[PDB]
Amino acid sequence: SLSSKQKATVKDFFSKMSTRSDDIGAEALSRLVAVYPQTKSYFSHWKDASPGSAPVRKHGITIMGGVYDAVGKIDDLKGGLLSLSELHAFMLRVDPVNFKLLAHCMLVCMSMIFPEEFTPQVHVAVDKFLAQLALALAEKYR
Amino acid sequence: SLSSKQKATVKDFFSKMSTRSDDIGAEALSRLVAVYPQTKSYFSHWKDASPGSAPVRKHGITIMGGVYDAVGKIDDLKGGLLSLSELHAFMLRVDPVNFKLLAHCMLVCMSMIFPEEFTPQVHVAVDKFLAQLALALAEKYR
């Protein structure tokens, strides 16, 4: 749970990375699939993985779209992402551990692209946000 | 998050354990301290971690107090356990990886003591309860 300060930190940082949103998402999903090769099994029905491959690049933009939507509803994530949880946790039965790995990836891209801005304090607020989002997605597991 | 059928399974399973409260906590606690010795650091002010130990038995009962309370507060465990979170997550700085080591041992004591009645169904609901209980206690880390 984020304090009100921490939510402001997250609304303010996500706004500052809007113009590089797509590139963060594509880098993140690309790194997820290169760095943690077990994640490709979830995407085996596509005809590609890893950067350059546009399917990974446009699925990364979709993920970030979901991420930017979670920011907008940062005061009730459990109730507001119920459809996405149904899909990830119930339909696809994505293993819960894959969320901490995707989050880490997104964190290194954010730091990679906004190094002066991504201070320990921003890191904490965002880390906490991503975990809370993972847990909103976890609502329909069982 | 806990569904109605979950809350109900927990409430009516806790009824069995009213008498046994002293016994269950102490046993679970004895088992966490023996099987998972990383946990001992937090109790280094006790002269004995055996079962039978005077502090293990006093603290076992206390743990189940907190567990009853939590059965009370099943609708808002995040709101409900703020004092206990402050204690564990901030003052004591218990590594959150430990919570499941206690939780596991409670489920072992509930299975020995209530075999055939402690079904997979009841296990779903009790595990969900204890997993949320740990999230609840985790509120005041950062």
Place this chain on the structure above:
Amino acid sequence: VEWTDSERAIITSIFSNLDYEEIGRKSLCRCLIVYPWTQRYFGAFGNLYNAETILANPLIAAHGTKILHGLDRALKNMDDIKNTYAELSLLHSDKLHVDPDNFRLLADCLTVVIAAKMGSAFTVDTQVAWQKFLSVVVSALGRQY
């Protein structure tokens, strides 16, 4: 790892008393009910619609058994546990994809099944020994370095 003599005695006792068909069935059934994302890797095992169906599903209970015999290959070879499970480790992580943490989830469930069957005879000392055994088994079944 150094096994003591009592640990070896305790581990072989645990097994001796267990119906591999009934421990298998109950353990895997509980894993899939308690941790339902693990059903992803068992789509070809009939209907997994709810607790009751799963608990009544024969090819689940047959695969259960095959896990408890898998565990025997470590009861029978307690000092060569990494190498005994190397063919399996390859199979699980690559041809099936399962993450390291699911092996713990099923071990937690085997422990709960055995705690229930052994009743009071599942002592602290027994649990410590069982757990060490499982830690090693679980460490051997995951990816190596």
Place this chain on the structure above:
Amino acid sequence: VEWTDSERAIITSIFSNLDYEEIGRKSLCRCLIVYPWTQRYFGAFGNLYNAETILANPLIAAHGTKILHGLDRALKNMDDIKNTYAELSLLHSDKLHVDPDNFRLLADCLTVVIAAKMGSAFTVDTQVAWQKFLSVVVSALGRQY
């Protein structure tokens, strides 16, 4: 695992952009602030009261460098990672009882400090190799079975 030969080139490339006197201090500074329960394990270090205290605390900086120097040792002993860290394993996992998940935390914070410094130079396959090197060390630091 078996190293590919660009896996090694990519690892030394990363390590060649790490000044341990600057990076060591910041990787640990950052773990203590982001994962603050990790502070308990370093009782000796004195004031960790706040971020200002974390970053100004000479014992944190100095240890950051020891830890990061330790991490860098497998680069020179890469097919013997396990025996290279067997004593550190016993120190962290047998004596001090650091939960293994904290190893992942420090290392995740390190990578994040690295990505800030290297920029896009740090590619996706560079990072994969890097993470293969971290997962091997961490795996070596855990309780050895």
